């Protein structure tokens, strides 16, 4: 059950994420798991990031989920569950903005 995840923000926009994570607090890979507005079944993981070009900003990927079983960012790395996905993640960046950190505050 994802909805039990303290990461799991469910239903909340894409600007409601971004408000969270434009917190001059957060260090980069702050993140959370939210539904898509608009891509039915799919979750997007938004996640904070920091450099001196762009300073503090926000980014956001799609999570597919297959009835067939695995969640994926892309297809060539899937997981058995969604908290697998975002175990390897917290350790990988990968093609992500930066691997995940710590859970957005509310
Ligand atoms: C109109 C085309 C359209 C396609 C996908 C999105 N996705 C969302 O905004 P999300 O970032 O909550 O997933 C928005 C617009």
């Known amino acids: ?4 995840e303290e990461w799991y923000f469910g239903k909340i926009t894409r600007r409601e ?5 434009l917190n001059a607090e957060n ?3 702050t993140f959370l798991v ?4 608009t891509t039915k079944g799919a979750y997007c ?5 920091f450099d001196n ?3 503090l900003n926000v980014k956001h990927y799609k999570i597919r989920k297959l009835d067939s079983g695995g969640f994926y960012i892309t297809s060539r790395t899937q ?3 969604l908290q697998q996905l975002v175990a390897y993640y917290s350790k990988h960046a990968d093609g992500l903005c930066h691997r995940l950190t710590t859970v957005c505050p509310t």
């Open 79 to 81: 997981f058995n569950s």
């Open 53 to 55: 070009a762009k300073g």
């Open 1 to 4: 059950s994802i909805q039990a």
């Open 17 to 21: 994420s971004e408000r969270l994570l």
């Open 34 to 37: 939210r539904e898509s507005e």
């Open 45 to 49: 993981l938004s996640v904070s990031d």
């Open 27 to 29: 260090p980069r890979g």
